Each structure stands twice: as structure tokens, then as C-alpha cells.
Amino acid sequence: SHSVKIYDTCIGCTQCVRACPLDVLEMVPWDGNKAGTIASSPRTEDCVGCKRCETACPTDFLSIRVYLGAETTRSMGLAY
Amino acid sequence: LLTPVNNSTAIRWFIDNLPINRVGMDEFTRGLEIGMAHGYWLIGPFALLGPLRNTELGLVAGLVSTIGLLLISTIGLSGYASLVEDVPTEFDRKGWSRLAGGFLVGGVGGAIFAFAILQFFPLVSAIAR
Amino acid sequence: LLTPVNNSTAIRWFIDNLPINRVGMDEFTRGLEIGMAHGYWLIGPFALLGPLRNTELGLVAGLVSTIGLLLISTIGLSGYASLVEDVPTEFDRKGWSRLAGGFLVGGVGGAIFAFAILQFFPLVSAIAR
Amino acid sequence: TRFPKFSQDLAQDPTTRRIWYGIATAHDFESHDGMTEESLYQKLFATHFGHLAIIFLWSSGNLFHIAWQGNFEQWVSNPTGVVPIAHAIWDPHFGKGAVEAFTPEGGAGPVNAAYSGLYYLYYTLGMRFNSDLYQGSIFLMVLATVFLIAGWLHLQPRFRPSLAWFKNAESRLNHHLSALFGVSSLAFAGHMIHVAIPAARGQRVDWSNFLNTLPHPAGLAPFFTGNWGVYADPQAGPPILTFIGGLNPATGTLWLTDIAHHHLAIAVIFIIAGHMYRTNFGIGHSIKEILDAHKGPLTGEGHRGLYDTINNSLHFQLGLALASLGVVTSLVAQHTYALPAYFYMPQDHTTMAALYTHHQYIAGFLMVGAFAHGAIFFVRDYDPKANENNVLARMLEHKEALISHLSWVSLFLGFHTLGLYVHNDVMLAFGRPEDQLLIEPVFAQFVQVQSGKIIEGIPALFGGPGVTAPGEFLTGWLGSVNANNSPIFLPIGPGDFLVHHAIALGLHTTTLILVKGALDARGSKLMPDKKDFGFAFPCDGPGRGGTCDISAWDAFYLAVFWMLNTIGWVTFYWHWKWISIWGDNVAQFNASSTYLMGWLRDYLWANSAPLIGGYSPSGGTNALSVWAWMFLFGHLVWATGFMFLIAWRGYWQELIETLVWAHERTPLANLVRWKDKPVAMSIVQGRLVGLAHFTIGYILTYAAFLIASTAALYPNGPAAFTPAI
Amino acid sequence: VVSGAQVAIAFVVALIAGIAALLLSTALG
Amino acid sequence: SYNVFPALVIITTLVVPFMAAAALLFIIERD
Amino acid sequence: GSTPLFGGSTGGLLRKAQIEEKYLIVWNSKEEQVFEMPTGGAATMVAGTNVLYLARKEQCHALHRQLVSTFKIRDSKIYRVYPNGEQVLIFPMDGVPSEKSNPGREVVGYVPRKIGDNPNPVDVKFTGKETFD
Ligand code: CLA
Ligand code: CLA
Ligand SMILES: CC1=C(/C=C/C(C)=C/C=C/C(C)=C/C=C/C=C(C)/C=C/C=C(C)/C=C/C2=C(C)CCCC2(C)C)C(C)(C)CCC1
Ligand SMILES: CC1=C(/C=C/C(C)=C/C=C/C(C)=C/C=C/C=C(C)/C=C/C=C(C)/C=C/C2=C(C)CCCC2(C)C)C(C)(C)CCC1
Ligand SMILES: CC1=C(/C=C/C(C)=C/C=C/C(C)=C/C=C/C=C(C)/C=C/C=C(C)/C=C/C2=C(C)CCCC2(C)C)C(C)(C)CCC1
Ligand SMILES: CC(C)=CCC/C(C)=C/CC/C(C)=C/CC/C(C)=C/CC1=C(C)C(=O)c2ccccc2C1=O
Ligand code: SF4
Ligand code: SF4
């Protein structure tokens, strides 16, 4: 399973959560930004590693990072 | 998707009664019939198109060629049989293993039988002469 | 007592994957591989050192000799198989019995295959002439 | 799925990627599960014993096959009239036309000619009988067994050396310099003086008589009393140690007594050198002390910290070792043709071409690998804190200046060198060959003149080698540099100018790709956290503009193409200049090498004719049919590489899913099921497999062309010369 | 020449290198 | 003086590669 | 208790000890000391309770004889171990040694006559009855 880490530069724009085609991500409440929220990655066992979340992230250098790890049936995207 | 190729009745009866699918068979006898079928016809390309096809030992060379092809095929099948672990009776590990043994015995035997027919087919008309 | 002969790893892997010990095999296919191995090399001493070794039918005499040796060996093994009663799967009575059947089929077949190679090995270089 | 046992990440992969990546990561011992530093060095030491043993088994196999199947004794009796034999052929696919094409005249059966030069090596060392070769083969197999036992023994828990033993740099340097270099070279000087020089004199010295055979009649009495000139004096018996210099005009090769004196002189230098560093006897240098003192005002901290940087990074050590090996391997190639050591080897033109090309391609791979492990060092082992402000961290600090100037030099060379070739090609096309840009290589002719080449308009600056090397070698050196049929400092002209700048383009461009990959290995503007992803990873996805081939591994992959291209230019140039010499066609080389059609027509097109006629419907087959077939095989493999390099993964993965559908729906075949799910090869694997087919196809094509063109059109030559005074 | 005895000797030396390689390769794994 | 053992070619280039491939199949597919 | 310190030998248990019966001998030791195994070789008994698996009852009784004669260890107990796992104490049966007479034992094998008054074999012809009855 890939590791999806969220760093403290997150502005809570939720764009990575909307970008994700696997519902890996969600917003939890936070105090570190004005939005009061931060992305979280509770369901990374469904993460395929497509990095659409990283594409959507607007912060210079990104607040969300996908590290491609061990491959599973889910993470390889296999229908068989 | 349900197609006429997927759904014909005497096509379904034929496939269901091929020795790999036929009810009541042991996996050895399944492999034996399969090998005998394949080894029989497989000598044809080896004997007629092989490098010694125009010499008098062309049939013998095609026979030993076919046995070589069946032995290497059996290595894959017997190795497959040792590693499957999956399903009950015919796809048992011992089940596939008995099929591999029967396939090789039938395969070599089918080639030898086809060799004997090709080597001694003049005898079927020998009564008249 | 635990010795280096008793304990080497790729010696243990080799013995564990000989057909008498290899996981996933049926006892017939076990016997088939064992017979094919033994019948193959056994024709060598019979064909080269037998009484007809210097005549043109020395290989045929060695082939029928090897089949005789395997048939008598099978009588001991099949008789052993009928009388064991002891243990489950491979040392089952039917288990040893299927091994005895496979041994004889493979043994005679290994001798015939080794006969064909010794009788027709000039064919492997026949393309050049 | 327990394979691979060293990686539980890979072992739990249910796809076919588990098999490929287990193979590809099997020798990456640092990244394995449960690896410690101490167990890593212990595993390497024993693995190195296994690699050593393979080298000796390879050499024993060559010795056995030449002894058992070759014609060494028949070749020793007639070195000009006998083609050396590598090994016999037994191929049951051969028809009658192939058996007789490979069967030499009067011969018993089909054989391969040998182009490794092993006969010339064995003969020059003094071997004269098949029993010499067979006892070499047995001895190297026993030597291989000893190293295999040693590797096994040093894995036993009583003999596994500690981590401090492996990191004792000073003791390893003292022993490797004094014994592994020095004593080994001293021993070789012993072989030359006791065995090889008497064999050249016609006196058989072997194990049965070498204890009672004086190599010099005054034996060892001039050595200890300091009267050493007796070993060089022709009136005190045949000399064993000389400094004649140059090449032997009867053979075209180095003087054997010069070779013996060379290895004796450098043995003393290496034995002395291996007394430099401080082991357990109080005296000697600390390497950490030498490095820490060398700190100047412009380079910051200087070399401080570099001891612990090098001694704790195997990738740094390997990168240094590969770079030095690669320089030395090129030097072997350049000096083997220019100063040949082996009897009858310069007369074997195919062997000289094969040996130059072999060692330059090896040198090219070693150079690329040195920069690869330099890049791996920066991602895996480089600690910026322990290397704070030293010369290493200062390279990374001005890395945009390094890359942009390397980019400038390669564009500066590439624009004008290509522009000059194209200018000359247009001139030739329009019938104006006197309007070519033909630049005289006067700076290199200046170098030749300083070594005593007589070239009319070029001055000897310091006064010539009479002033600058007034040694005993000077008469034999000057007689060999100015002689015809002498390979020392070949005549060069404008065609030599243009290809040397093309070579310099290939050297700077390949370096640029490798250095940028090594210096952007840790991060760039497009990927500032690249070191967190490692050496080899596919990309960072299509975001930020797209990031394909961003890893340091991908810069290795790109530079292999440029290395293959550069060594291609180098070996094309060596081959065409030498076949123009061997074929008495130097004026054609000087005329047609200044424009690129001349390279296409007069080098590639003309010398392909015996190769592609190696088999034909009109004339059957000949001995070149195997090279003709390999030449086509190499084109096929190279072109197959293009499929992997161009058609990337997502095409193939969607194709495989339809095949997976087809298998599961096909009767009698869907009963058979895979244990590992078929997937397309990974993005990195597609690049590696495509590079592998490209590279193998590159090498096999050129080797088939180089050997068959030389062995058919220019196989043999005199190599004797008349010295010049 | 390399007689038949010397070929047989060479295979015995090769067999001993083979078991030595077998010892090393299992100690390495 | 054409010294070959053809049976050694058959064994080392045909038989034991197919058996090494079978052995390697057991190594990479077991468990 | 634990096994005595012994590096193993080829003179110990065979497949009979897996399928038919093996034997267990239990003794207490006050001092760690070296004794000869009945299988062959030297072992060391621990300072505690010692348990040792042997192939025959005679091997167990031979060790008990060694433990008495050499080390003055008296309290040895021998068990017959069945392959299902059942232990049956066989030595000593009633806690009192066999050589000392004990009220409570039944006389077994007693023939109430001197040996020369046994009947003739012709007297017991065509029966399974023996002349030692
Ligand atoms: C006769 C035909 C000819 C042609 C068609 C070219 C064509 C080219 N030259 Mg070349 N060149 C020539 C003759 C020619 N040159 C001669 C006779 C010389 C010797 C002086 C050079 C020396 C030369 C240099 C040093 C460079 C070129 C470069 C170039 C390329 C871009 C030039 C440009 O004007 O970009 C438009 C101009 C710019 C983008 C900026 C101005 C660049 C100038 C050259 C820098 C001036 C600074 C300083 C005074 C001189 C350089 C410093 C130092 C290297 C000496 C272009 C392909 C450039 C190149 O190869 O880039 C890799 C380059 O740097 N040429
Ligand atoms: C023949 C094929 C070819 C050619 C000409 C090039 C050329 C170049 N490569 Mg490339 N390369 C190639 C194949 C080739 N490559 C392949 C197969 C790979 C593996 C993928 C690479 C991988 C690679 C890497 C990794 C790098 C290069 C770099 C370079 C540049 C090197 C510097 C130089 O020589 O400047 C001179 C420029 C040339 C020789 C290019 C041709 C210029 C033309 C002839 C001028 C056109 C004028 C014309 C009138 C305009 C067209 C108008 C028309 C439409 C009407 C140069 C642009 C390097 C770089 O970018 O350096 C800064 C670099 O790092 N290459
Ligand atoms: C036309 C048609 C068809 C057909 C087709 C085909 C394709 C067929 C084929 C066929 C075949 C393909 C056949 C074969 C046969 C075979 C045989 C007949 C065999 C025999 C064998 C034998 C007899 C053997 C024996 C042996 C030996 C010798 C030794 C060992 C043992 C054994 C016993 C094994 C169908 C029906 C579908 C339908 C209709 C039409
Ligand atoms: C060197 C070496 C080795 C080896 C050894 C040996 C001892 C071997 C042997 C081998 C052998 C010994 C082989 C054999 C083979 C066989 C075969 C190849 C067979 C075949 C057969 C067949 C094919 C048959 C068939 C048949 C018939 C004919 C009829 C009936 C049925 C059947 C099917 C049975 C090892 C590996 C250990 C290790 C390393 C080294
Ligand atoms: C990236 C990296 C790396 C790599 C590097 C490399 C790969 C390098 C290379 C480099 C090189 C590849 C270099 C070379 C150079 C050489 C030289 C420096 C030479 C010089 C010489 C000379 C100067 C000589 C002189 C002379 C002459 C010419 C003649 C006369 C005589 C005489 C001797 C005087 C490492 C691993 C560290 C780590 C970090 C990263
Ligand atoms: C090693 C072993 C156990 C073998 C057992 C015995 C077996 C089954 C041998 C069979 C080997 C083969 C030939 C496997 C097919 C390879 C394959 C999936 C190719 C499609 C493919 C192509 C053409 C590309 O260009 C490409 C480029 C970039 C990324 C991915 C790809 C890619 O995926
Ligand atoms: S890599 Fe793809 S699947 Fe994984 S969290 Fe990001 S968008 Fe979702
Ligand atoms: S990680 Fe990036 S895209 Fe996701 S909420 Fe934070 S700022 Fe927005």
C-alpha cells in the first residue's frame, strides 16, 4: 500500500479530497490554518497511487505526498 | 455476455464429454485420453516436415521428436500440478498430478501408435499381394 | 546426532524435491518419474556389458534385460504395497500400489527411450550428411 | 509467495512484478530486510570470493578448450600460416554447407577461430606445449576452489571479520599496494626472467628444470653487490633487464627484457608505496590527518570529513573504483595498439580490432557506472552535516554553474563540429571539395613532436626528447616513433581533427547527463524532495507540467545511449583509420573522413560486403555466415528495444487485461490458472528492458561487423619495421 | 595432447570446484 | 583431433536448462 | 525436571519409540556430575530432577544400577511411555525395593515342589499344559 502523508503547509482547500478517485482522503478539523481543516488519509489501502491529489494541491511545495510502496491487488488497480 | 458460440447445445454436449470434462473419469484416464489424442497427431508435422523427412529414418526421427515435445510439456504440467493448491477433485494437486502422468503415458503412446501406423500402413493391403 | 551431512540446506532442498518427497504429487506420477529415471540409466550396463554387447542386437538384448529387471523389482514393490497397511497418504496401501504401477510404466518407458537414443543417436547429426 | 525472501514488500505482491523485481533487487544488499552494516560487509567479502572464482573458472575453460580443441602447438610451429582456434563447434542444426565452411583446410571438424588474443598471450609468456595449457587449466580450477572455500570459510561464525576489520583503510592500502600490486608485479618480472625470456631465446625452462637453470650466467652475484649493469650487458651473457625503448623491429612488439625491467621497477615503487600508511607499528600516515590538513581559503573546509564520508559509503568507494578502472581500461585499449606487448598479435588485425573495441566498450560501461554509484551515494549515503562546507558539499552548492557550463561546452562543440561536417558534405555534393573546412590538428602534432616525431612545420619547444628524456631508451624510442609500419603516434590530418571534437562532444555530453543526474539526485526545483523517493523511481506523475524521467536512475538510462554513441564514434574511427592503414588506403581515409557521406559509403557500405555475403542463394555459406546472422540478429534486438522505449506501460496493461479476459473465458484453457496475476512491466522496467535490448543489439551488430569485415578483407599483415635514423 | 585421462582428471577437479561453489552459494543465501 | 562430447552439449545446453527452469519455477512459485 | 546434558548419539531411540513403547527414567541428583549413557558416551546429570528417554527397560535398569553403584542415587523411577502419551510406572512397583521382603506382595510363579518332582512330558502329551505347572 502507498503512503499518503499530509504536511503542515495544508491550507484546507479540500482540492486533493475532491480530486481523489478512490475516496482515500477526507477533511478533519484543525487549527493550523484559517480554514480550520486539514486533509487526512485514513483509507490508503485503497490508494492506487495515481497522484491526482498531488496535482490538485496548490501549495508551493505540496502539502500532500504520495510515496509508492508495496503493491497489492487494490493498489495495482486490478479488476482480476 | 451470452452469445451463440457460448450457448450451442451439441457444442455444449461435446465439450462436456471431452475427457477433461467428462463425468465419472479419473484424472489419470483423463490425461491418458488427452495424451493419446495429442501424441497421435503431433508426430505428423514432426515426421513430414522435420529435417530428416526425405530420408528413410524420417518417421523414427519424428517419433523421438514428438516424445521430446511431450516430455517438456509434461514438465510444465507436472510442475503446475505441484504448485496449484486451489480447488477440489479434478483441480486437486494430486488430481492435476495424475493428469500429468496420464498425459505423458498417453502422449508417448499416441506417438508410438501413430508411428506404427505410418511405418506399417502397407500391411493393411498386404493380403491382396 | 546432528551432522553436516544430515543438515545441508540445498541438500535438504534437493531431497525434498525428488519425486518421492516432492509436495503436490500423486503417487502414480511419483513412481512414473522414478521409473523413468532408473529405467533410462539401467539399460547402460545391460547394453554395454551384457553377453550380446559385441553383436548388432546388443541394444535390443539390453532393453529386454532392463524390462526384466524392472518387472521383477515391481513384483517386490507391488507385493510390498499390498502388505504395508501402515501410514496415510503416500504410505497408504493404494498409495504405494499406484507408485508401483507408475514405477513399472516409467521404468520400461525410460529403458525404451534410452534404447531409442542409443539406437538412433546418429540421427542427431544426420542433417550435415 | 516467499520469493523474494529478502523483501517482504515484494514477496506479498500478487502479480508478476514480484518475480521481476526480486531478480532486479537481489544484489542491492543495503535495501534488504534485516540488513545490518556488519552483515553487509561480511556478505560482500564472501561474494567477492565467488566472483573471483568465476574469473578463474572462465580462464581455466579458455585454457582447457585451447589445449583440448585448439591448434596451439601447430600454431607455435607456424604462427603466420595457422589461424588460432577458440573451440570446436558441435551444432546439430548445421547442414553440410555449414560444417565444411567452419572446417578449416585439411581439418577434422568445424571450429571457431579465436579473436581473444589468448594464443599471443600464452606464447609470449613462454607456453609452448598443450601440456603447458592443460596444467594452467587445472591450476586455475584449483585456485578457483580455494577462493570458493575461502568465501565459505569467512562466512563461518569464527572467521567472519568484524566491521572494524573492513574499515581498516590504512592496513588494506598498505597490503594492496605492497603485495597485491608490488609483489605480484615482482613475481611477474620473475616469470619473465626465469621462463618467458629463455623461451624467446629457445631455451625451455619449466618446473622440472628451473631450480637448476640460471636466468643469467652471473646469477644473483651482481644483484647483491650493487653491480647491476651486468644484467643489461650483452658481453656478460644474454641480458635480462634492459631499457632499449621503443618496439622490437623484428617483431613490432615491446622488448621482453624491457617488460621485465618495467615490472621490476614498478614493483619497487609499489612496495615502497605500501609503507605509507599507519598500521600497528607507530610509523606511517593517518589518512584522516592528511585530508584534514588540506584546507585552503577558497575551498571552505577543504577535505575535512571526507575520510568518514568515503570509509562509510560503499557507493562512493565503488564509484571511485569504477572510474579508475574505466580510465585504466581505456588506457589499456590506447596502449595495446600503440605499444603492443604480444608476439604475432599486431599481425592479427582482427584480434587488434576486437581487443581495442572490447576494452573501450568496457571502459564506457565502467565510466557510466562510476557516475551511477556517485548518484546513488548522494541519495543514500551523503550526509550534509558531516560534510559541512567541505569540497563535496561545495560541488552541490554551485551545481547550476557546473551543469550550465557543461551544457554550454556540449552545445559549443556540437553546433560547430556537426556544422563543419555538414559544410564539407554540401561542398562535396556541389563539386567543391577544395572549399571544405579542413582544420589541421597542429596541437596534437605538437604533442607528437615533443616525443620526437619529425613533423616539418611544428616546433619541438624544449628542444626535443634529446633534451627532455635523455635516457638509455632514447635511441630505440626515436627509431620506433619515426619508422614506417610503426603504430606509435599515427599521422593525423583534418579527418582526425573533426572526429576528435566529435569524441570530445560525446565525452562532455555523456558527462553532462551523468553529472546532472548525480547533482540533481537529491532534488531540483521540479522535485525538491527527490531523495525521499530514492535512486530509481518512475516519475512523480503528470502534475507540475509532467515529470517523466526525473530520477537519477533515468539520467543513467539516458547517458547509456550517449556512452554507446560516443564509444561507437571512437571505435568507428579506430577501425576505419586502421583498415585504411592495413589495406593501403590511407589517402582514401584522409579524403573521405572529412564529410559524413564518406563515413557512410567508404566505411559502412564498403566493408559490409563480405559480411552480408556470408550466406546467399547464389554462393551458399562461408565462415562469415555466423557473423552475417549475428549482424541481422543485432539489428533485430536493437529494434525490439525501440518497442519498450517508445510504447509505454498503460497501452500494454489494457492489452493484457483483454488477454486475461480471453484466458478466463476460453474452454479447456480456463481450467489452467496463473498463480501470479499477469501485469504489464513497470515503468522503470520498460526503460531497463528497452535499454538492454538496445545495448545488446548495438554491441552484437558492431561486433559482427568489426570481426567479419576485418577477418575477410584485412586479416593479416607484416608488423616488422625498419627503425629510423 | 589432452588425453582421455586428462579430460577425466579435469572433470574431477571441476566437480570439487562445483561442491565448493555449492558450499559458498548456500552459505550466501 | 575434432574432440567433442555431443552428449555433454545435449545435457548442458538442453536438459539442465529445462531442469533449472523447472527448479526455478518451484523456487519462485512455492508457498 | 530436565534432560541430562548430552550432545546426542546414534545409539538412542528408533521408530519403535514412536510407534510401540519407550521408557522414561526419573532420578534426583544433588550434584552435577558425569555419568555414562547406556546408549554410549558420557553425559552430565543436572543438579535437580533428571528425565531421560530410553529404548528398553533393560537400558533404564542398567542406568539405575549405575546410579546406585557409582553415585549412591537410590530413588530412581522407571516409566513405560505409550505412543498415545500415557505413562505407566513400572519400577519400583510398590515403593519397597524388590530385594527386601514386603508384606503385601502376592507370590507369583510358585511351584510347591522341588524341581525333580515335575511330571514327565508323556503325562502332558496332547495339551498346551506344561510340566512346570
Ligand atoms: C562562420 C560561421 C559560424 C556560425 C554559423 C556559428 C554559429 C554559432 N556559434 Mg560560433 N563561432 C564561430 C563561427 C560560427 N559560429 C567562430 C569563427 C568563432 C570563434 C570566435 C565561434 C565561437 C563561438 C562561441 C564562443 C560561441 C559560438 C556560438 C554559436 C551559436 C550561437 C551564436 C549566436 O550568435 O547566438 C546569439 C547570441 C547569443 C545567444 C549570446 C551571445 C553569445 C556570444 C557568442 C558571447 C560573447 C561573449 C564573449 C565576448 C565571447 C565568448 C566568451 C569566451 C567563450 C571566449 C551558433 C550555432 C555560441 C554557442 O556555441 O553556444 C553554445 C557560443 O557561445 N561560436
Ligand atoms: C542524431 C541524433 C541526436 C542529436 C543531433 C542530438 C542532439 C543533442 N542532444 Mg540528444 N539524444 C539522442 C539523440 C540526438 N541528440 C538520443 C537518441 C537520446 C536518448 C534519449 C538523447 C538524449 C540526450 C540527453 C540526455 C541530452 C542530449 C543533449 C543533446 C544536445 C547536445 C549538445 C549539442 O551537441 O549541441 C548542438 C546541437 C545539435 C547537434 C542538434 C541539432 C541542431 C540542428 C542541426 C540545427 C537545426 C537548424 C535548422 C535550420 C532548423 C530547423 C528549421 C526547419 C524546421 C525548417 C544536442 C541538442 C543534451 C543537452 O541538452 O545539452 C545541453 C543532453 O543533456 N540528448
Ligand atoms: C472431423 C470432425 C471431428 C474431428 C476432428 C479432430 C480434430 C479429430 C482428431 C482426432 C484424433 C487426433 C485422433 C487420435 C486418435 C488417437 C489414437 C487412436 C491413439 C491411440 C494410442 C494408443 C493405442 C496408445 C497406446 C499406448 C502405447 C503404445 C504405449 C503406452 C501406453 C499406451 C496405452 C498409451 C469432430 C469429431 C470434432 C466433429 C466432426 C468432424
Ligand atoms: C551431475 C549432477 C547431477 C546428476 C546426477 C545424476 C545421477 C543424474 C542422472 C540423470 C538421469 C538418470 C536421467 C534420466 C532421464 C530419463 C529420461 C529423460 C526418461 C525419459 C523417459 C521417457 C520419455 C519414457 C516415456 C514412456 C514410454 C516410452 C512408454 C511408456 C510411457 C512412458 C511415458 C513412461 C545432480 C543433478 C544430482 C547434481 C549436479 C551434478
Ligand atoms: C559523481 C560522483 C562521483 C564520481 C566521480 C567520477 C566518476 C569522476 C571521474 C573522474 C575522472 C574520470 C577523472 C580522471 C582524470 C584524470 C586525470 C586527472 C589525468 C591526468 C593526467 C595527467 C595530467 C598526466 C600528465 C602527463 C601527460 C599528459 C603526458 C606527459 C606525462 C604526464 C604524466 C606528465 C563520486 C563516486 C566520487 C562520488 C560523488 C559523486
Ligand atoms: C521470468 C519468468 C518466471 C519467466 C517464465 C516464462 C515466461 C512467461 C516468459 C515470458 C516473458 C515475457 C515476454 C513476458 C511479457 C512482457 C510484457 C508484459 C510485455 C508487454 C510490454 C511491452 C511490449 C513494452 O514495450 C512496455 C514498455 C514500458 C512498460 C511496460 C511494457 C510492457 O509491459
Ligand atoms: S494517489 Fe490517487 S488514489 Fe491515492 S490518495 Fe492520491 S488521488 Fe487518491
Ligand atoms: S493537501 Fe493540498 S489539496 Fe489537500 S487540502 Fe491541503 S492544501 Fe488543499
| Three state DSSP letters for C17-76 | CCCCCCCCCCHHHHHHHHHHHHHHHHHHHHHHHCCCCCCCCHHHHHHHHHHHHHHHHHHH
Distance CA B57, CA B47 (A): 9
Atom of ligand 7 at shortest distance to CA of A2? Answer: 4
Distance CA C75, CA C69 (A): 10
Q: For residue A74, give the amino acid letter.
A: R
Distance CA C38, CA C107 (A): 6
Q: Give the three cell numbers for residue F19.
A: 531442469
A13 belongs to an annotated ligand binding site: yes
- A17 CA → ligand 8 middle, Å: 8
User: Is D671 an 8 Å CB contact of chain B?
Assistant: yes
Ligand 4: residue of C17, C36, C115 to mutate (most ligand atoms within 8 A of CB) is C36
CA of C107 vs chain D CAs: smallest distance (Å)? 29
The SS3 call for residue C112 is helix
Phi/psi at D70 (5° precision): -80, -165
In chain A, what's the furthest Cα-to-Cα distance? 44
Atom of ligand 7 at shortest distance to CA of A46? Answer: 3
Distances (CA, A) of G120 to D499, G113, G127: 124, 14, 13
Distance CA D671, CA D665 (A): 10
- A2 CA → ligand 8 middle, Å: 18
Distance CA B76, CA D106 (A): 46
Q: Which chains have 3 or more CB–CB distances shorter than 8 Å to chain E?
A: C, D
Residue window 642-661, chain D: list those with CB within 8 Å of chain A: 657, 660-661
Nearest CA in chain B to F23: B79
Q: What angle do CA D641, D642, D644 make, to 5 degrees?
A: 70
What secondary structure does DSSP assign to D216-238, as a single string? STTTTHHHHTS-GGGGG-GGGSS
User: Is C73 an 8 Å CB contact of chain B?
Assistant: no
Distances (CA, A) of C17 to B79, C8, C25, D1: 11, 14, 10, 18
Resolution of this entry in Å?
A: 2.0
CA of C44 vs chain B CAs: smallest distance (Å)? 19
Residue C23: list chain F partners with CB under 8 A.
30
Q: How would you classify the pairing of strands D615-616 and G77-81?
A: unpaired
Distance CA D171, CA D161 (A): 14
Atom of ligand 4 at shortest distance to CA of F16? Answer: 36
Q: How would you classify the pairing of strands D620-621 and G22-28?
A: unpaired
Q: What angle do CA C74, C79, C83 make, to 5 degrees?
A: 145
Q: Is C50 exposed, middle or buried (0-12, 13-18, 19+ CB in 10 A)?
A: middle
Measured from the alpha carbon of residue A30, the closest ligand is: 8
Write down the residue that cell numbers 562532444 correspond to.
D505
Residue E15: list chain D partners with CB under 8 A.
none
Distance CA D237, CA D454 (A): 36
CA of D79 vs chain F CAs: smallest distance (Å)? 19
Q: Which chains have 3 or more CB–CB distances shorter than 8 Å to chain F?
A: B, C, D
Q: Do C125 and F26 touch (CB under 8 A)?
A: no
Write down the residue that cell numbers 475516496 correspond to.
A23
Nearest CA in chain D to F6: D90
Q: Which chains have 3 or more CB–CB distances shorter than 8 Å to chain A?
A: D
Distance CA D17, CA A73 (A): 12
Preceding omega of D4 cis (within 30 degrees of 0): yes
Q: Give the three cell numbers for residue A47.
A: 490508494
Q: How was this structure determined?
A: cryo-EM
Preceding omega of G92 cis (within 30 degrees of 0): yes
Q: Give the three cell numbers for residue D158.
A: 569464527
- For an interface test with F, give the residue of B65, B70, B75, B97 to mutate (most F CBs within 10 A): B75
CA of G37 vs chain C CAs: smallest distance (Å)? 14
Q: Whose CA is nearest to atom 14 of ligand 4?
A: C37
Kind and range of the H or E run holding B101: helix B93-120
- D637 CA → ligand 3 middle, Å: 41
Q: Do F18 and B72 touch (CB under 8 A)?
A: yes
User: Is D15 an 8 Å CB contact of chain A?
Assistant: yes
Distance CA D284, CA D287 (A): 9
Q: Do E1 and D149 touch (CB under 8 A)?
A: no
A72 belongs to an annotated ligand binding site: no
- Residues enclosing ligand 2, CB less than 6 A? D 407, 410-411, 414-415, 418, 505, 509, 512-513, 558, 561
Q: What angle do CA D273, D274, D280 make, to 5 degrees?
A: 135
- For an interface test with F, give the residue of B67, B70, B74, B83 to mutate (most F CBs within 10 A): B83
- For an interface test with D, give the residue of B27, B80, B89 to mutate (most D CBs within 10 A): B80
Distance CA D335, CA D341 (A): 9
Nearest CA in chain B to D669: B20
Question: Among G59, G113, G117, G123, which Cα is nearest to G91's?
Answer: G59
Q: Is the CB of D548 under 6 A from ligand 6?
A: no
Residue window 7-36, chain G: list those with CB within 8 Å of chain C: 7-10
Tell whether the torsion through CA atoms of G96, G98, G102 and G107 is positive or negative: positive
Q: Do B75 and F26 touch (CB under 8 A)?
A: no
Which residues 6+ apart lie within 8 Å of B29 measured at CB?
Answer: B19, B102
- D324 CA → ligand 5 middle, Å: 8
- For an interface test with B, give the residue of D94, D665, D668, D674 to mutate (most B CBs within 10 A): D668
Kind and range of the H or E run holding G50: strand G49-54
Q: How would you classify the pairing of strands A37-40 and A26-29?
A: antiparallel
- B79 CA → ligand 8 middle, Å: 51
Distance CA A42, CA A71 (A): 18
Q: Is the CB of B50 under 6 A from ligand 3?
A: no
Distance CA A57, CA A14 (A): 9
Distance CA D285, CA D276 (A): 6
Contact C128, C57 (CB under 8 A): no
Distance CA D128, CA D196 (A): 10
Residue C127: list chain D partners with CB under 8 A.
92-95
Residues of D with CB under 8 A from a CB of F: 1-3, 19, 22, 68-69, 88, 90, 92, 107-111, 675-676
Q: D84-112 burial, b if ≥16 CB within 10 A, otherwise e?
A: bbbbbbbeeebeeebbbbbbeeeeebbbb
Which residues 6+ apart lie within 8 Å of D120 measured at CB?
Answer: D342, D343, D344, D345, D348, D351
Which residues 6+ apart lie within 8 Å of D169 measured at CB?
Answer: D277, D287, D307, D311
